[PDB]
Amino acid sequence: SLQFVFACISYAVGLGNVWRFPYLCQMYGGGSFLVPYIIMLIVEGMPLLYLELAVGQRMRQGSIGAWRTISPYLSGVGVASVVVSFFLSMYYNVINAWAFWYLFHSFQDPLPWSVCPLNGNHTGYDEECEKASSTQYFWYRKTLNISPSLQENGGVQWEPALCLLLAWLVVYLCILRGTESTGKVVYFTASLPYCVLIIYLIRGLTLHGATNGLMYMFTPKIEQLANPKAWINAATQIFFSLGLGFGSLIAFASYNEPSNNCQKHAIIVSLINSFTSIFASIVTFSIYGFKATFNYENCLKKVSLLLTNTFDLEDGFLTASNLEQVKGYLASAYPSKYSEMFPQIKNCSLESELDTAVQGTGLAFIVYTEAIKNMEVSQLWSVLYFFMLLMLGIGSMLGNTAAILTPLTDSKIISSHLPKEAISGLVCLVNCAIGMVFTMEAGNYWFDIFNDYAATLSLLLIVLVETIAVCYVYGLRRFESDLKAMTGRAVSWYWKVMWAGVSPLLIVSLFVFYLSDYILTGTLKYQAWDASQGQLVTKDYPAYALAVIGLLVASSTMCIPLAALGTFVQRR
Amino acid sequence: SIWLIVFGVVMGVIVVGIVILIFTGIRDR
Ligand SMILES: *[C@@H]1O[C@H](CO)[C@@H](O)[C@H](O)[C@H]1NC(C)=O
Ligand SMILES: *[C@@H]1O[C@H](CO)[C@@H](O)[C@H](O)[C@H]1NC(C)=O
């Protein structure tokens, strides 16, 4: 019935493609990132998703069991599929914390991101809140309290820490309570995000200067199309959104009937995920284009007002549509006065604003708060959207934590030493203790590090290992014969070609290009808030942050080879 | 402080729910 299709939708719609995708799309030039993603969907999404589902269905085991049955000296990869998930559980729930925060500041008539606080004389606005938008000031100062540079970090902020603790308690409560009731929840926890995004698209397309954002998002600029970072980010994002590498897909496929259809399931899941991500990006970039157009209008208005006040002009004589000509006339009238303010005049254009209006790990929150503050009944829409985002985050965290606990649940030694219900509490406590780092003054920088590198190389390496093992280790012909015996209609030559030498080759080529780019540039830099300019400035990563990122990647990458060496020694 | 009051209420509700769930689990023991 339609319940199965709704369950597939719920598995496909998650916090990943709704929150992470718009920020990546804006970072990498919009269309110049959207084109690879689709290309990275028909090549790496559907084939690898179907391979994972088929492996899970055929093996009738968990992730560790499935990757141990195929080959002994490869079973360590099953441990790796845990480690990455662990790191995800380290930081992903932090997102929910922010949601909680942004929910709790939604029951006030003067919304905290609606009106800028006064300087103190009760006559003007804060310099940071004047240079930056109200939403950006609320996000970067009253929510994260971010420090200008990663080198200087303060103590653990108590309010974000409390929000994170609340998020972890909610996750633990959901773990203890729900195990099989989701069948009812799927009737409601799967269609609400689509309704919310429909409402926000309705609002966004009614805003002035909204189509500029869509035109920017769908424009594939060839200048930035050749950036390897865009391809690598698209690949890691599609792998993170589909759930590849985490091992949850294999665990879910192990619980389904041997005659259950998988090709249709994989294609439907992949296409639904891509379409949902595209729709969310459309809405977010409509709102972002509205913000950029509003900033452009504001800058033109400020320049026009300044020129009118310094040249004794009429209130309406100088407009945006006839600016430069008038300036030229002033250049012909008396350049002595014109040069007195020539450095003061600013050159503002739509392209530059669209490139740098809003950016960072919190593009979704800033953009949607901007959209909410331009509504009719702001509080209701804010509550609905943040509840939807919190529900998506809780569902994704439930899936990830179940994938983490399942190998630990299967541990006979662990189960006989501690109660099964206490392992979840211990995991939640440890994850909260580790994730308390992201609540410092510079915690957002660490969150950015763990959003860029805790899932980039690890997922790609795990997927490459899986496709190599199912490609040549077990034998593609044997796998096809087993699948044909299980269900018939043996794999079409498209799937066999994709699994044989297309996906591994493409992933290896992307990795080589990324490594070469990093080696040649050698300038891995992060964005940092600058209150004086009220913008984002690129700054070089310090040594210790690079060491932390390298260690985080290296543990996940070396989880497999170390266990392979251990198994080889055990054999020898 | 609207947000602090709402956070306190939500935390109390979550604490009560977790306490009753753990009590039921202990009963399962
Ligand atoms: C606020 O008052 C102080 C008093 O010294 C003054 O220095 C400051 O310029 C005032 N603010 C503005 C925006 O003029
Ligand atoms: C604006 O354009 C003029 C024209 O060359 C240039 O001299 C100036 O540096 C640019 N920027 C500003 C802030 O005026």
Residue numbers in the entry:
A (entry chain C): 11 to 582
B (entry chain A): 740 to 768
Q: Which sentences from the paper describe this structure?
A:
Several plasma membrane transporters import proline into the cell, including the Sodium/imino-acid transporter 1 (SIT1) encoded by the SLC6A20 gene. SIT1 belongs to the SLC6 gene family of amino acid and amine transporters, and the larger Neurotransmitter Sodium Symporter (NSS) superfamily. SIT1 adopts the classic LeuT-fold expected for this family of amino acid transporters, while ACE2 is composed of peptidase (PD) domain and collectrin-like domain with transmembrane and neck regions. As with the homologous ACE2-B0AT1 complex, the structure is a dimer of heterodimers where homodimerization of ACE2 is mediated primarily by its neck domain while the ACE2 and transporter subunits interact via three distinct sets of contacts.
We therefore determined the ACE2-SIT1 structure, with an open-conformation peptidase domain, in the presence of glycine to a resolution of 3.46 Å overall and 3.76 Å for the transporter alone. Without a secondary amino acid substrate, SIT1 has undergone structural rearrangements that open the transporter’s cytoplasmic gate. The greatest movement is a rigid body 17° tilt of TM1a. This movement breaks most of TM1a’s closed-conformation hydrophobic interactions with TM6b and TM7, and the hydrogen bonds of Ser11. Rather, in this inward-open conformation TM1a forms exclusively van der Waals contacts with TM5 and TM7. The open conformation of SIT1’s cytoplasmic gate is stabilized by TM1a’s interactions with TM5, which has moved laterally within the membrane. Within the SIT1 map determined in glycine, there is no apparent density for amino acid or chloride, though the binding site is similarly resolved to the pipecolate bound structure. Most pronounced, the unwound region of TM1 has repositioned, distorting the hydrogen bond donors and acceptors which previously coordinated the substrate’s amine and carboxy groups. The tilting of TM1a has shifted the carbonyls of Ser20, Ala22, and Val23 by 1.4 to 2.3 Å, disrupting the Na1 and Na2 sites. These structural distortions reduce the valence at the Na1 (vNa = 0.26) and Na2 (vNa = 0.08) sites, suggesting that both have lower affinities for sodium.
